[PDB]
RNA sequence: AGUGAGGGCGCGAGCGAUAACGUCCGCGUCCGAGCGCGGGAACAACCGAGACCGCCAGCUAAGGCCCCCAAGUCUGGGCUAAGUGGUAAAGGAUGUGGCGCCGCGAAGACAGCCAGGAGGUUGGCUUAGAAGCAGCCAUCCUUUAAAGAGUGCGUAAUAGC
RNA sequence: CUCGAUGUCGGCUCGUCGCAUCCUGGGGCUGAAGAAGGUCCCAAGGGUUGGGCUGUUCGCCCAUUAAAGCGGCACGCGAG
RNA sequence: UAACCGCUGAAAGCAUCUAAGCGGGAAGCCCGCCCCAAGAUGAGGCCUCCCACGGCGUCAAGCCGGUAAGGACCCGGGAA
């Protein structure tokens, strides 16, 4: 009824191999997990995740294999770029090539490195983020960077995802 | 050379060139009112007038007798034990005082005044 | 990074604009007496000797163990792993460059047999209000039903001199390439005019 | 915040989070860090 | 002729704090004084059981059968999965599984979605502001996406979600 | 159990484990600006001074200190 | 890895660090640091070297020389 419907457009390399499903698209040969009982098909344009039951384990498993391998696909279709925005009077940014310029620790050496699907985008640099491929590892690295200085609820000067409304509280007494 | 409890000598605005220190002002584990150091004490000896009194200051380490061994293998020993009394900051006590030169002191540095102050013979 | 030696004696010297004290290291130059090839002793390494005490005196075995890659006529020998032999004979006439940091050790001069007194710190007990043991003696050793007995590994009286050991970092100070000698300002680890060795390890980030 | 007990949520919409036998309430207000595992 | 003082367990009253391998009395068993065997790890009194002496005999208690060690790593149907097994209460909880029950307007559901979030809604005080999103209650009307006497981020009302 | 025998205090000397950790760090929280406090969960690693008076350990007081913890072992220690 | 922070994600067709799978992280845990150590009968591993030593009832795992192959003994010396 509902927790298993998805199409596999682009004629993507949509195949199941040694107990691992191989989703190959712009290159992201993404390895989407395959629980032995979940099971799925990709015929015509329709890709379906099945349920060898419906109890707790399985049902969640469904939500997963479905959503996550769904990922495998959408991903293999484009290229996974994380939109991110650096912003704060205290900070600098430029690709440098394969790292993380960055400067707001007032002893700025910030020489980072790009894991993989990770390409650096400095078009601002106020607006500035990265592109990845692997939705999981991408949101992640993004995070790594955010984390390393970003916080600031009461005074801003950080890195922000899309940049949530950053809830902020007063300083002294007024 | 050192001591905890001590009958030491001074010669600043002293009540008497003598006070008894408790211990060393250094790294919490005294045991050595040592050459060129800074420590704690009260008076032992008398004091004609003088705004000094029978109280207690802290201050800095002069002479010793049991090896003033310096960086340059400069070497010495005076058959005398005494330091200069301090007022807070360190800023020495008296206008002058009876004694003289030699590395260790100035070297500790913080007290140049003592430095130029006790120069000549004695 | 290793030197094999006959430790001489400790003495004082001067450096820059100040004196300070060193020690006399002396080593003719050990040589590839035995090699653990790895396929040989996958604990790969070099064993060498560095002098020579009388030949008329020498077990056959020794004679041929030498035979091996054949070298000379001594008796001072020992081994160390993870150290290539970019040679087949070593001296230190450069082997050990000065103005460098080193680590080193040797035999440990042989003490005696003194209790709580020696062996360990804290000089014995006290003396006066009690003299049925005057000044020092053995601390305490356990108790009633705690472990219900006598303990098993706290310091103890006696023999504590016939052993060996080493010192962490020390300075290479100076190199005398002729008389294969080097001054190093060292804890003269163990006697002198006897046996020692040096090795260098310290990826120490200050 | 934590407490080997209590926790009846709070921040008017304070979340009952299941994590490691860890009775942990999660919200949008630090005031509610409810760690009772 | 011997004990003329004894303890334990279960139930029933004391007492004690409804504490103690406490001490008081009673019904029973007990254990000594047989209570020497099984046993529960090993443990005087907790379930089994009375040993006159044999058996390189077989049926059984209790309680056991992957192994250490005799005995199915039986079959059958479940429910937990924390290692509970392998001591604990008060009490806490979108634990796990189970009821015996509630919402299904396929006049096609809920979390996810889209857009509008309607005009009198405009003081009552306070109006510096209520003109739902400042305090003392208001509980009506038209009007359609069906209607918020406006559950909520708020300041100067207000303006926006 | 112990009265055919179990040395009770205070201290000494050598201590050994423990965490409801004092200093240490790791932390979320603040009525958190900074700094600094204070509010809990994690973690014993090392560390966890001198004197004064008092036979008193506790204690009060002098001087510092990063700090100068509570306590288990017949309140460890007489075959020391 | 502790608390504590996150990524990807369902079962709770919006959400969640959370079984699934991934990461951050403590002066603490294994290592790295030195010091013991196959009497770790589960080593000995490598090097050199005397010979497979010589006589005795086969089962010769007993005798004697065998080798100074080597070492012990006594002597003489040692911060051992």
PDB file of N, CA and C in Angstrom, chain A residues 50-135:
ATOM      1  N   UNK A  50      10.097  -4.488  -1.931  1.00  0.00           N
ATOM      2  CA  UNK A  50       9.155  -5.416  -1.372  1.00  0.00           C
ATOM      3  C   UNK A  50       9.349  -5.622   0.115  1.00  0.00           C
ATOM      4  N   UNK A  51       8.346  -6.248   0.717  1.00  0.00           N
ATOM      5  CA  UNK A  51       8.275  -6.495   2.154  1.00  0.00           C
ATOM      6  C   UNK A  51       7.987  -7.973   2.539  1.00  0.00           C
ATOM      7  N   UNK A  52       9.027  -8.772   2.896  1.00  0.00           N
ATOM      8  CA  UNK A  52       8.793 -10.179   3.267  1.00  0.00           C
ATOM      9  C   UNK A  52       7.963 -10.371   4.539  1.00  0.00           C
ATOM     10  N   UNK A  53       7.228  -9.320   4.905  1.00  0.00           N
ATOM     11  CA  UNK A  53       6.345  -9.277   6.071  1.00  0.00           C
ATOM     12  C   UNK A  53       5.783  -7.859   6.181  1.00  0.00           C
ATOM     13  N   UNK A  54       5.793  -7.313   7.390  1.00  0.00           N
ATOM     14  CA  UNK A  54       5.294  -5.965   7.621  1.00  0.00           C
ATOM     15  C   UNK A  54       5.482  -5.541   9.082  1.00  0.00           C
ATOM     16  N   UNK A  55       6.091  -6.422   9.888  1.00  0.00           N
ATOM     17  CA  UNK A  55       6.333  -6.146  11.311  1.00  0.00           C
ATOM     18  C   UNK A  55       7.250  -4.918  11.451  1.00  0.00           C
ATOM     19  N   UNK A  56       7.699  -4.622  12.668  1.00  0.00           N
ATOM     20  CA  UNK A  56       8.570  -3.469  12.909  1.00  0.00           C
ATOM     21  C   UNK A  56       9.873  -3.426  12.077  1.00  0.00           C
ATOM     22  N   UNK A  57      10.727  -4.436  12.273  1.00  0.00           N
ATOM     23  CA  UNK A  57      12.012  -4.544  11.574  1.00  0.00           C
ATOM     24  C   UNK A  57      11.839  -4.329  10.095  1.00  0.00           C
ATOM     25  N   UNK A  58      11.042  -5.198   9.494  1.00  0.00           N
ATOM     26  CA  UNK A  58      10.795  -5.082   8.083  1.00  0.00           C
ATOM     27  C   UNK A  58      10.239  -3.706   7.710  1.00  0.00           C
ATOM     28  N   UNK A  59       9.062  -3.321   8.192  1.00  0.00           N
ATOM     29  CA  UNK A  59       8.501  -2.025   7.809  1.00  0.00           C
ATOM     30  C   UNK A  59       9.539  -0.888   7.819  1.00  0.00           C
ATOM     31  N   UNK A  60      10.288  -0.750   8.911  1.00  0.00           N
ATOM     32  CA  UNK A  60      11.287   0.311   8.905  1.00  0.00           C
ATOM     33  C   UNK A  60      12.222   0.031   7.736  1.00  0.00           C
ATOM     34  N   UNK A  61      12.733  -1.200   7.653  1.00  0.00           N
ATOM     35  CA  UNK A  61      13.627  -1.633   6.566  1.00  0.00           C
ATOM     36  C   UNK A  61      13.159  -1.161   5.191  1.00  0.00           C
ATOM     37  N   UNK A  62      11.840  -1.178   4.995  1.00  0.00           N
ATOM     38  CA  UNK A  62      11.132  -0.737   3.779  1.00  0.00           C
ATOM     39  C   UNK A  62      11.348   0.761   3.621  1.00  0.00           C
ATOM     40  N   UNK A  63      10.881   1.508   4.624  1.00  0.00           N
ATOM     41  CA  UNK A  63      11.054   2.946   4.559  1.00  0.00           C
ATOM     42  C   UNK A  63      12.467   3.206   4.088  1.00  0.00           C
ATOM     43  N   UNK A  64      13.414   2.492   4.687  1.00  0.00           N
ATOM     44  CA  UNK A  64      14.823   2.629   4.319  1.00  0.00           C
ATOM     45  C   UNK A  64      15.189   2.256   2.889  1.00  0.00           C
ATOM     46  N   UNK A  65      15.396   0.967   2.632  1.00  0.00           N
ATOM     47  CA  UNK A  65      15.838   0.509   1.335  1.00  0.00           C
ATOM     48  C   UNK A  65      15.211   1.386   0.293  1.00  0.00           C
ATOM     49  N   UNK A  66      13.924   1.666   0.481  1.00  0.00           N
ATOM     50  CA  UNK A  66      13.201   2.501  -0.460  1.00  0.00           C
ATOM     51  C   UNK A  66      13.803   3.903  -0.563  1.00  0.00           C
ATOM     52  N   UNK A  67      13.739   4.650   0.525  1.00  0.00           N
ATOM     53  CA  UNK A  67      14.269   6.002   0.541  1.00  0.00           C
ATOM     54  C   UNK A  67      15.767   6.115   0.170  1.00  0.00           C
ATOM     55  N   UNK A  68      16.603   5.329   0.841  1.00  0.00           N
ATOM     56  CA  UNK A  68      18.063   5.338   0.694  1.00  0.00           C
ATOM     57  C   UNK A  68      18.552   4.855  -0.669  1.00  0.00           C
ATOM     58  N   UNK A  69      18.001   3.774  -1.186  1.00  0.00           N
ATOM     59  CA  UNK A  69      18.481   3.383  -2.483  1.00  0.00           C
ATOM     60  C   UNK A  69      17.884   4.390  -3.471  1.00  0.00           C
ATOM     61  N   UNK A  70      16.684   4.902  -3.168  1.00  0.00           N
ATOM     62  CA  UNK A  70      16.021   5.938  -3.982  1.00  0.00           C
ATOM     63  C   UNK A  70      17.100   6.993  -4.172  1.00  0.00           C
ATOM     64  N   UNK A  71      17.760   7.267  -3.054  1.00  0.00           N
ATOM     65  CA  UNK A  71      18.909   8.142  -2.988  1.00  0.00           C
ATOM     66  C   UNK A  71      19.869   7.612  -4.057  1.00  0.00           C
ATOM     67  N   UNK A  72      20.443   6.426  -3.820  1.00  0.00           N
ATOM     68  CA  UNK A  72      21.371   5.811  -4.764  1.00  0.00           C
ATOM     69  C   UNK A  72      21.057   6.348  -6.153  1.00  0.00           C
ATOM     70  N   UNK A  73      19.792   6.253  -6.551  1.00  0.00           N
ATOM     71  CA  UNK A  73      19.402   6.763  -7.853  1.00  0.00           C
ATOM     72  C   UNK A  73      19.487   8.290  -8.019  1.00  0.00           C
ATOM     73  N   UNK A  74      18.567   9.063  -7.450  1.00  0.00           N
ATOM     74  CA  UNK A  74      18.619  10.514  -7.673  1.00  0.00           C
ATOM     75  C   UNK A  74      20.072  11.012  -7.729  1.00  0.00           C
ATOM     76  N   UNK A  75      20.858  10.413  -6.848  1.00  0.00           N
ATOM     77  CA  UNK A  75      22.259  10.745  -6.773  1.00  0.00           C
ATOM     78  C   UNK A  75      22.917  10.394  -8.088  1.00  0.00           C
ATOM     79  N   UNK A  76      22.994   9.104  -8.397  1.00  0.00           N
ATOM     80  CA  UNK A  76      23.620   8.691  -9.640  1.00  0.00           C
ATOM     81  C   UNK A  76      23.139   9.547 -10.818  1.00  0.00           C
ATOM     82  N   UNK A  77      21.939  10.103 -10.710  1.00  0.00           N
ATOM     83  CA  UNK A  77      21.460  10.969 -11.774  1.00  0.00           C
ATOM     84  C   UNK A  77      22.249  12.275 -11.823  1.00  0.00           C
ATOM     85  N   UNK A  78      22.207  13.085 -10.764  1.00  0.00           N
ATOM     86  CA  UNK A  78      22.976  14.345 -10.879  1.00  0.00           C
ATOM     87  C   UNK A  78      24.476  14.297 -10.488  1.00  0.00           C
ATOM     88  N   UNK A  79      24.721  14.782  -9.272  1.00  0.00           N
ATOM     89  CA  UNK A  79      26.027  14.866  -8.627  1.00  0.00           C
ATOM     90  C   UNK A  79      25.650  15.532  -7.304  1.00  0.00           C
ATOM     91  N   UNK A  80      26.045  14.997  -6.151  1.00  0.00           N
ATOM     92  CA  UNK A  80      25.576  15.642  -4.936  1.00  0.00           C
ATOM     93  C   UNK A  80      26.282  16.804  -4.305  1.00  0.00           C
ATOM     94  N   UNK A  81      25.815  17.995  -4.659  1.00  0.00           N
ATOM     95  CA  UNK A  81      26.365  19.249  -4.166  1.00  0.00           C
ATOM     96  C   UNK A  81      25.626  19.797  -2.963  1.00  0.00           C
ATOM     97  N   UNK A  82      26.348  20.022  -1.868  1.00  0.00           N
ATOM     98  CA  UNK A  82      25.690  20.581  -0.702  1.00  0.00           C
ATOM     99  C   UNK A  82      25.726  22.073  -0.719  1.00  0.00           C
ATOM    100  N   UNK A  83      24.554  22.669  -0.681  1.00  0.00           N
ATOM    101  CA  UNK A  83      24.505  24.098  -0.655  1.00  0.00           C
ATOM    102  C   UNK A  83      24.798  24.555   0.753  1.00  0.00           C
ATOM    103  N   UNK A  84      25.776  25.439   0.895  1.00  0.00           N
ATOM    104  CA  UNK A  84      26.117  25.957   2.206  1.00  0.00           C
ATOM    105  C   UNK A  84      26.613  27.405   2.187  1.00  0.00           C
ATOM    106  N   UNK A  85      26.279  28.102   3.255  1.00  0.00           N
ATOM    107  CA  UNK A  85      26.668  29.480   3.274  1.00  0.00           C
ATOM    108  C   UNK A  85      27.522  29.922   4.410  1.00  0.00           C
ATOM    109  N   UNK A  86      28.754  30.273   4.098  1.00  0.00           N
ATOM    110  CA  UNK A  86      29.517  30.902   5.186  1.00  0.00           C
ATOM    111  C   UNK A  86      29.148  32.389   5.452  1.00  0.00           C
ATOM    112  N   UNK A  87      28.993  32.819   6.710  1.00  0.00           N
ATOM    113  CA  UNK A  87      28.744  34.253   6.905  1.00  0.00           C
ATOM    114  C   UNK A  87      29.130  34.787   8.266  1.00  0.00           C
ATOM    115  N   UNK A  88      29.939  35.841   8.259  1.00  0.00           N
ATOM    116  CA  UNK A  88      30.388  36.446   9.501  1.00  0.00           C
ATOM    117  C   UNK A  88      31.567  37.390   9.327  1.00  0.00           C
ATOM    118  N   UNK A  89      31.410  38.627   9.799  1.00  0.00           N
ATOM    119  CA  UNK A  89      32.458  39.641   9.703  1.00  0.00           C
ATOM    120  C   UNK A  89      33.805  39.006  10.007  1.00  0.00           C
ATOM    121  N   UNK A  90      33.780  38.007  10.880  1.00  0.00           N
ATOM    122  CA  UNK A  90      34.994  37.310  11.250  1.00  0.00           C
ATOM    123  C   UNK A  90      35.104  35.984  10.528  1.00  0.00           C
ATOM    124  N   UNK A  91      35.722  36.009   9.352  1.00  0.00           N
ATOM    125  CA  UNK A  91      35.924  34.818   8.529  1.00  0.00           C
ATOM    126  C   UNK A  91      36.367  35.160   7.105  1.00  0.00           C
ATOM    127  N   UNK A  92      37.146  34.265   6.498  1.00  0.00           N
ATOM    128  CA  UNK A  92      37.612  34.423   5.118  1.00  0.00           C
ATOM    129  C   UNK A  92      37.435  33.070   4.408  1.00  0.00           C
ATOM    130  N   UNK A  93      37.397  33.057   3.078  1.00  0.00           N
ATOM    131  CA  UNK A  93      37.235  31.787   2.376  1.00  0.00           C
ATOM    132  C   UNK A  93      37.594  31.784   0.893  1.00  0.00           C
ATOM    133  N   UNK A  94      38.300  30.729   0.496  1.00  0.00           N
ATOM    134  CA  UNK A  94      38.731  30.504  -0.882  1.00  0.00           C
ATOM    135  C   UNK A  94      39.160  29.037  -1.005  1.00  0.00           C
ATOM    136  N   UNK A  95      38.894  28.432  -2.155  1.00  0.00           N
ATOM    137  CA  UNK A  95      39.212  27.024  -2.365  1.00  0.00           C
ATOM    138  C   UNK A  95      40.664  26.650  -2.118  1.00  0.00           C
ATOM    139  N   UNK A  96      41.567  27.472  -2.633  1.00  0.00           N
ATOM    140  CA  UNK A  96      42.996  27.243  -2.492  1.00  0.00           C
ATOM    141  C   UNK A  96      43.424  26.073  -3.339  1.00  0.00           C
ATOM    142  N   UNK A  97      42.447  25.261  -3.718  1.00  0.00           N
ATOM    143  CA  UNK A  97      42.739  24.112  -4.548  1.00  0.00           C
ATOM    144  C   UNK A  97      42.053  22.850  -4.079  1.00  0.00           C
ATOM    145  N   UNK A  98      42.410  22.409  -2.874  1.00  0.00           N
ATOM    146  CA  UNK A  98      41.848  21.198  -2.278  1.00  0.00           C
ATOM    147  C   UNK A  98      41.957  21.258  -0.747  1.00  0.00           C
ATOM    148  N   UNK A  99      41.276  22.251  -0.164  1.00  0.00           N
ATOM    149  CA  UNK A  99      41.282  22.458   1.280  1.00  0.00           C
ATOM    150  C   UNK A  99      40.160  23.362   1.759  1.00  0.00           C
ATOM    151  N   UNK A 100      40.411  24.019   2.887  1.00  0.00           N
ATOM    152  CA  UNK A 100      39.448  24.919   3.493  1.00  0.00           C
ATOM    153  C   UNK A 100      40.102  26.211   3.952  1.00  0.00           C
ATOM    154  N   UNK A 101      40.136  27.228   3.087  1.00  0.00           N
ATOM    155  CA  UNK A 101      40.735  28.512   3.455  1.00  0.00           C
ATOM    156  C   UNK A 101      40.284  28.788   4.874  1.00  0.00           C
ATOM    157  N   UNK A 102      39.169  29.481   5.024  1.00  0.00           N
ATOM    158  CA  UNK A 102      38.641  29.716   6.353  1.00  0.00           C
ATOM    159  C   UNK A 102      39.576  30.473   7.294  1.00  0.00           C
ATOM    160  N   UNK A 103      38.996  31.405   8.038  1.00  0.00           N
ATOM    161  CA  UNK A 103      39.754  32.248   8.940  1.00  0.00           C
ATOM    162  C   UNK A 103      38.850  32.998   9.929  1.00  0.00           C
ATOM    163  N   UNK A 104      38.830  32.569  11.188  1.00  0.00           N
ATOM    164  CA  UNK A 104      38.030  33.236  12.220  1.00  0.00           C
ATOM    165  C   UNK A 104      38.348  32.655  13.593  1.00  0.00           C
ATOM    166  N   UNK A 105      39.589  32.201  13.728  1.00  0.00           N
ATOM    167  CA  UNK A 105      40.078  31.657  14.980  1.00  0.00           C
ATOM    168  C   UNK A 105      41.250  32.542  15.362  1.00  0.00           C
ATOM    169  N   UNK A 106      41.396  33.619  14.595  1.00  0.00           N
ATOM    170  CA  UNK A 106      42.452  34.615  14.770  1.00  0.00           C
ATOM    171  C   UNK A 106      43.860  34.014  14.874  1.00  0.00           C
ATOM    172  N   UNK A 107      44.048  32.932  14.135  1.00  0.00           N
ATOM    173  CA  UNK A 107      45.303  32.206  14.036  1.00  0.00           C
ATOM    174  C   UNK A 107      44.889  31.184  12.993  1.00  0.00           C
ATOM    175  N   UNK A 108      44.290  31.748  11.954  1.00  0.00           N
ATOM    176  CA  UNK A 108      43.714  31.120  10.770  1.00  0.00           C
ATOM    177  C   UNK A 108      44.254  29.946   9.984  1.00  0.00           C
ATOM    178  N   UNK A 109      45.466  29.432  10.268  1.00  0.00           N
ATOM    179  CA  UNK A 109      45.757  28.309   9.377  1.00  0.00           C
ATOM    180  C   UNK A 109      44.578  27.328   9.343  1.00  0.00           C
ATOM    181  N   UNK A 110      43.912  27.198   8.181  1.00  0.00           N
ATOM    182  CA  UNK A 110      42.752  26.292   7.993  1.00  0.00           C
ATOM    183  C   UNK A 110      42.868  25.316   6.785  1.00  0.00           C
ATOM    184  N   UNK A 111      44.102  24.959   6.446  1.00  0.00           N
ATOM    185  CA  UNK A 111      44.389  24.052   5.344  1.00  0.00           C
ATOM    186  C   UNK A 111      43.668  22.723   5.482  1.00  0.00           C
ATOM    187  N   UNK A 112      42.509  22.594   4.843  1.00  0.00           N
ATOM    188  CA  UNK A 112      41.766  21.343   4.910  1.00  0.00           C
ATOM    189  C   UNK A 112      42.055  20.510   3.649  1.00  0.00           C
ATOM    190  N   UNK A 113      41.181  19.571   3.314  1.00  0.00           N
ATOM    191  CA  UNK A 113      41.364  18.765   2.117  1.00  0.00           C
ATOM    192  C   UNK A 113      39.992  18.263   1.716  1.00  0.00           C
ATOM    193  N   UNK A 114      39.783  18.013   0.426  1.00  0.00           N
ATOM    194  CA  UNK A 114      38.468  17.536   0.014  1.00  0.00           C
ATOM    195  C   UNK A 114      38.390  16.018   0.014  1.00  0.00           C
ATOM    196  N   UNK A 115      37.520  15.440   0.861  1.00  0.00           N
ATOM    197  CA  UNK A 115      37.428  13.979   0.856  1.00  0.00           C
ATOM    198  C   UNK A 115      37.267  13.434  -0.580  1.00  0.00           C
ATOM    199  N   UNK A 116      36.034  13.350  -1.089  1.00  0.00           N
ATOM    200  CA  UNK A 116      35.822  12.858  -2.455  1.00  0.00           C
ATOM    201  C   UNK A 116      34.829  13.661  -3.303  1.00  0.00           C
ATOM    202  N   UNK A 117      33.586  13.201  -3.433  1.00  0.00           N
ATOM    203  CA  UNK A 117      32.623  13.936  -4.243  1.00  0.00           C
ATOM    204  C   UNK A 117      32.697  15.428  -4.002  1.00  0.00           C
ATOM    205  N   UNK A 118      33.439  15.769  -2.961  1.00  0.00           N
ATOM    206  CA  UNK A 118      33.669  17.127  -2.498  1.00  0.00           C
ATOM    207  C   UNK A 118      34.505  18.050  -3.373  1.00  0.00           C
ATOM    208  N   UNK A 119      33.833  19.026  -3.955  1.00  0.00           N
ATOM    209  CA  UNK A 119      34.444  20.049  -4.777  1.00  0.00           C
ATOM    210  C   UNK A 119      34.085  21.297  -4.000  1.00  0.00           C
ATOM    211  N   UNK A 120      35.014  22.241  -3.926  1.00  0.00           N
ATOM    212  CA  UNK A 120      34.789  23.467  -3.177  1.00  0.00           C
ATOM    213  C   UNK A 120      34.306  24.657  -4.026  1.00  0.00           C
ATOM    214  N   UNK A 121      33.271  25.345  -3.532  1.00  0.00           N
ATOM    215  CA  UNK A 121      32.688  26.501  -4.215  1.00  0.00           C
ATOM    216  C   UNK A 121      32.706  27.753  -3.346  1.00  0.00           C
ATOM    217  N   UNK A 122      33.556  28.687  -3.786  1.00  0.00           N
ATOM    218  CA  UNK A 122      33.820  29.978  -3.153  1.00  0.00           C
ATOM    219  C   UNK A 122      33.159  31.156  -3.848  1.00  0.00           C
ATOM    220  N   UNK A 123      32.141  30.917  -4.679  1.00  0.00           N
ATOM    221  CA  UNK A 123      31.594  32.110  -5.312  1.00  0.00           C
ATOM    222  C   UNK A 123      31.004  33.216  -4.459  1.00  0.00           C
ATOM    223  N   UNK A 124      31.816  33.877  -3.630  1.00  0.00           N
ATOM    224  CA  UNK A 124      31.347  35.016  -2.827  1.00  0.00           C
ATOM    225  C   UNK A 124      32.347  35.818  -1.955  1.00  0.00           C
ATOM    226  N   UNK A 125      32.922  35.233  -0.901  1.00  0.00           N
ATOM    227  CA  UNK A 125      32.711  33.890  -0.393  1.00  0.00           C
ATOM    228  C   UNK A 125      31.537  33.840   0.584  1.00  0.00           C
ATOM    229  N   UNK A 126      30.901  34.987   0.860  1.00  0.00           N
ATOM    230  CA  UNK A 126      29.749  35.028   1.783  1.00  0.00           C
ATOM    231  C   UNK A 126      28.817  33.832   1.520  1.00  0.00           C
ATOM    232  N   UNK A 127      28.543  33.550   0.244  1.00  0.00           N
ATOM    233  CA  UNK A 127      27.745  32.376  -0.145  1.00  0.00           C
ATOM    234  C   UNK A 127      28.907  31.448  -0.434  1.00  0.00           C
ATOM    235  N   UNK A 128      28.892  30.234   0.103  1.00  0.00           N
ATOM    236  CA  UNK A 128      30.066  29.426  -0.128  1.00  0.00           C
ATOM    237  C   UNK A 128      29.741  28.183   0.588  1.00  0.00           C
ATOM    238  N   UNK A 129      30.044  27.101  -0.153  1.00  0.00           N
ATOM    239  CA  UNK A 129      29.721  25.720   0.189  1.00  0.00           C
ATOM    240  C   UNK A 129      30.538  24.684  -0.597  1.00  0.00           C
ATOM    241  N   UNK A 130      29.975  23.472  -0.661  1.00  0.00           N
ATOM    242  CA  UNK A 130      30.584  22.335  -1.352  1.00  0.00           C
ATOM    243  C   UNK A 130      29.613  21.432  -2.082  1.00  0.00           C
ATOM    244  N   UNK A 131      30.183  20.652  -2.986  1.00  0.00           N
ATOM    245  CA  UNK A 131      29.435  19.683  -3.761  1.00  0.00           C
ATOM    246  C   UNK A 131      30.019  18.337  -3.392  1.00  0.00           C
ATOM    247  N   UNK A 132      29.209  17.294  -3.366  1.00  0.00           N
ATOM    248  CA  UNK A 132      29.732  15.988  -3.021  1.00  0.00           C
ATOM    249  C   UNK A 132      29.409  14.897  -4.016  1.00  0.00           C
ATOM    250  N   UNK A 133      28.411  14.090  -3.681  1.00  0.00           N
ATOM    251  CA  UNK A 133      27.963  12.964  -4.498  1.00  0.00           C
ATOM    252  C   UNK A 133      27.137  12.085  -3.577  1.00  0.00           C
ATOM    253  N   UNK A 134      27.809  11.576  -2.551  1.00  0.00           N
ATOM    254  CA  UNK A 134      27.239  10.686  -1.543  1.00  0.00           C
ATOM    255  C   UNK A 134      26.495  11.448  -0.426  1.00  0.00           C
ATOM    256  N   UNK A 135      25.199  11.672  -0.648  1.00  0.00           N
ATOM    257  CA  UNK A 135      24.306  12.387   0.272  1.00  0.00           C
ATOM    258  C   UNK A 135      24.640  12.277   1.762  1.00  0.00           C
TER     259      UNK A 135
END
